[PDB]
Symmetry: D2
Subunit: 318 residues, 4 copies
């Protein structure tokens, strides 16, 4: 049969027999994502350019922020665009905390590079008056996670207890159509993605691991390399074709470059649910316990075999 | 004021007081790109997944192929998807030879990677019955050229005698708005783009040049690295952000992998018009004379300072 | 705050605490309407005219039909396009019966006149295997009714226990936006609607009533006249501006022309929910008991005052 | 083959070999209609309802007004929305005068009724400073005229010296696809269109005519009655299905309700270029010399045979 994000979600709801909040939460995220998408493809740019006579980062955040509060199922929201965690008014409070990057990669949206949105959904654990504390939970506590990629087409990838599901947006009818049910990442891929410009600053294990793909020790064929620069773009390619995505610590700080709460955990969750791995070299991303909401983390994720190899080598130099 | 692609071309047309063929030619190509873009963003994908009850490479090709023959401005079309050159029917012949790649990067559209259309437009030179011999001209003969980028937004870059112009597609009204008049490229960028997988097969000049970006001799900051794997994308970022794009010759062949007529020349011609550089290592891309319509050619292009720098290193190993 | 059909429907579900079926049903319904609208506005008409090189009544029905079956919330469906009731396969059965008119007004879609979709939702009462017998319920047993109007813009009017609501489709984000809460009709309007072509065949009661409009007895001001030809459009105009719509019996037969199950029952129901009136002249449309699923029925709906005037002039002739 | 509005016009302009102005005039107008159409189908209504967190007549006027000015082909512009005629700056002056109704039927856009843009293009005769005077020309002097219809689908009808042509707007690729070449209207139809709420004030000549439609003298079949209440729609129907449209003089004034400059003339011009007829009862609409740019005129247009019958009756009462 044919299936859509709303139908897929609704059903999962029924089976689950819950409160309905998550179904309502996820749905708002959905409307937001499309609204966002509408703007990213330059909806009515003509109007701004005087067709009638007379920032996208911020708008994206307002959409998401506003659609969630209206959901009535949120209490604490964190966004790569806000200094502190936004605390939802008493009248519209729910039981879920949402951590998200409204439009990741925006900085490079000038060259029409693929940009995306990332979201992670937790269930508030404590009974205290909401605060940012409710957002400092380990990726391992995620209820649902996913991202929307505004590429050649707009795709939304949702990961839940069941597994990962890929929906494509039919812009003609504003509907997310299921085009990939219960995904599973290749055991081993042949493409590695990482900014090799930071080479002079890599640790020796990352340096060796790279050498290992350029010049396979077992004289196998060398891996291919791709690096969009946009996390969602790169991570999604790694899910589809398999492979390995790296953004390890270096000179910036052994604390890594990507954010834990709304970039790392979310993807790790999706990766792990698809059957891959997502580590920091020292432990599992999802096992890492947040301290501050914009806290960074090193990330290595992709096909199981690849991540394990990296770790094999990481142990070597440890 | 506010201008569109059509209006833009129309005023240039009145200025030069020509026949109007090129104007029509460009318009057809324009509607062709709008068609392609609708397809790429998955317009009516729901009707393909049973909403009513019951390739993107060929679809795009048919679109360009049809559109152009309909304009009455062409006589010889050369496409990446077609083996031989299509010789237009005698009732729809014009005085223009068009070479193009309807959908580049098409081989990786699975991961929703950006894709683009590339096109070069020549003026049939001889008076002989139209044959593929008519597409065997050097890029320096180009009359107009450019590409379409189906990324986050849909942009069309048109390079002609006058300059390089960027037009954004307001999907809401299917119209191309000028957003960047007479574009020029930085003198020196800070990003290098090539596939570092083939490292085992890079020729030393390319190997050493890459070493210097990672470990700059003058201890300056190292360049950043990016590689989408789609020519339109990478080349467009190079134009917008400045920098250097590499696809040199090695083992595959002393000729590189990209094809001369519908990939290099157009891209090399846009660069040069934007005041940039495009070389094969031994000569300017626009100066190489074609032997066959599918002829391959090595390419290195981008900011002058960076292209010159590479050429300095290339010279060191010759 | 802002609200959409989906969010409005989900919170109604949460109030009522039910199985969730009717929610998926409306939702399934909502999707079909966006797709029908998409096609009605001629989505990709370019392609059928050869832009690439080489029915609406049917499609509308196919969509609705296929989306409803997929909801898992229906057991028997009735369409003005199918002669026998359709019994949903056992694997997709729900507890609801849906009688609808995919695209009413179609015949005249050649002139681009407005058109629409009418739908009525009944709950199954008996336990006998589903048959068209479960579709012969008086309009008075409707659980939910509604219609979509593909006019200058696309609107969806949903009527339920709680009353009437209007939603506008935002084509850019594929979302239905609530723009009129708990709609109530005027007590008295200034427009009468009917095809004055069948004048030579009007029964006296109707010929007198029309006189009363063109030459008001109390010498008040004459009512205006409007007849689109598309019921959905007429009735909607009536509901919004107030007045009286008439499609009474005559030579054709003391049954009128319109269908009771999927044309009159839904409008009449929406009307009585808006505080208006809808009679056949002998009784109330909703009180009429069906014998055949394609049974015709006389209709007069609109502002309470205007409708009562008819009934008074109707009694003067009985 | 396949053709677009822009291709059509460019081919007409190349044939004739004019100055090119008319060609830009047309495409500028085309662009406005696409924009209007977008706003009419409620492009981004979601935003104004707070999906982000925080007049259609006027806008339509600003789009046409600006696009025409920005064309460099006009000198005098008459609009229903402006009291005086707008005299184009001396820098953007062209040799054409354009009258138009930015969005006829807007007063009723509440019920979602069909609406449309009407336009007429006169060439400026004199060498005098452009003024309101230059728009005072007889329909007989039109150069191009047409109208956009925002019904169930958006179509633009263009009538010129060569004939009448209908273009269907394919909202997916943002282009107008020619779907009806050299249109011609039925010699006779079966639908009469007029507001019968004014029966009380009709003159006898018109009352008798309406009588012969309900009770045909040659006991033929009665004509159908259709009145949408929006000129563009009642006229487009007449043009597509044949029949006759009436808006004769009444109590309002022996001059009628419709405006001659931007409502009657255009319509009148299409009817005649399509075989039809347009009269004020006393003379061909296209032969009336205007005194004021907002001058009104009685109109009866449609199929020849139908209009002549009216004219036969009209004389019987003169
Ligand atoms: C189709 O509409 C419905 C009906 C029911 C529902 C729940 C209980 C019940 O009583 C037995 N009857 C209906 C729902 O419960 C829920 N619970 S929930 O928290 O939103 C949820 C959503 C998802 Cl993606 C996955 C798991 C869960 Cl846990 N959604 C529903 C949607
Ligand atoms: C309004 O659109 C017009 C009017 C005229 C045109 C040409 C001569 C003329 O004689 C007075 N009057 C008008 C055009 O000529 C041309 N010539 S052309 O070959 O297509 C052309 C297109 C471009 Cl991108 C740039 C230069 C030239 Cl060379 N396009 C026209 C478009
Ligand atoms: C998607 O959100 C939800 C949650 C619940 C639901 C029901 C019980 C419960 O236990 C606390 N928690 C949630 C629903 O029940 C229903 N019942 S229902 O039959 O579909 C329905 C839909 C509408 Cl338009 C109006 C009344 C009713 Cl009767 N829809 C739900 C949607
Ligand atoms: C799109 O390309 C072209 C080329 C030429 C054009 C004109 C003269 C010329 O000299 C040989 N070469 C080219 C045009 O002239 C015109 N003249 S015009 O006034 O705009 C016009 C437009 C239409 Cl709808 C119909 C008749 C006329 Cl009269 N449009 C052109 C468009």
């Amino acid at each position: 049969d044919v299936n859509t994000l709303t139908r897929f979600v609704m059903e999962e709801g029924r089976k689950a027999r819950g409160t309905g909040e998550l179904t309502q939460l996820l749905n708002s995220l959905c409307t937001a994502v499309k609204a966002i998408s509408s703007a990213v493809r330059k909806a009515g740019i003509a109007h701004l350019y005087g067709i009638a006579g007379s920032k996208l980062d911020v708008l994206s955040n307002d959409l998401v922020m506003n659609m969630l509060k209206s959901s009535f199922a949120t209490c604490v929201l964190v966004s790569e665009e806000d200094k502190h965690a936004i605390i939802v008014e008493p009248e519209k409070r729910g039981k879920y905390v949402v951590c998200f990057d409204p439009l990741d990669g925006s900085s490079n949206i000038d060259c029409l590079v693929s940009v995306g949105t990332i979201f992670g959904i937790y269930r508030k654990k404590s009974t205290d008056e909401p605060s940012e504390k409710d957002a400092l939970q380990p990726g391992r506590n995620l209820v649902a996670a996913g991202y929307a990629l505004y590429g050649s087409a707009t795709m939304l990838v949702l990961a839940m207890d069941c597994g990962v599901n890929c929906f494509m947006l039919d812009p003609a009818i504003g509907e997310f159509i299921l085009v990939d049910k219960d995904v599973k990442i290749k055991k081993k891929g042949k493409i590695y993605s990482l900014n090799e410009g930071y080479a002079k600053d890599f640790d020796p294990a990352v340096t060796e691991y790279i050498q290992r793909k350029k010049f396979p020790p077992d004289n196998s064929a060398p891996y291919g390399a791709r690096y969009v620069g946009s996390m969602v773009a790169d991570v999604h390619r790694t899910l589809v074709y398999g492979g390995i995505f790296l953004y390890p610590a270096n000179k910036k700080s052994p604390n890594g470059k990507l954010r834990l709460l709304y970039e790392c955990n979310p993807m790790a969750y999706v990766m792990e649910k698809a059957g891959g791995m997502a580590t920091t070299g020292k432990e599992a991303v999802l096992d890492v316990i947040p301290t501050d909401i914009h806290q960074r983390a090193p990330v290595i994720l992709g096909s199981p075999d690849d991540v394990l190899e990296f770790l094999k080598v990481y142990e070597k130099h440890s």
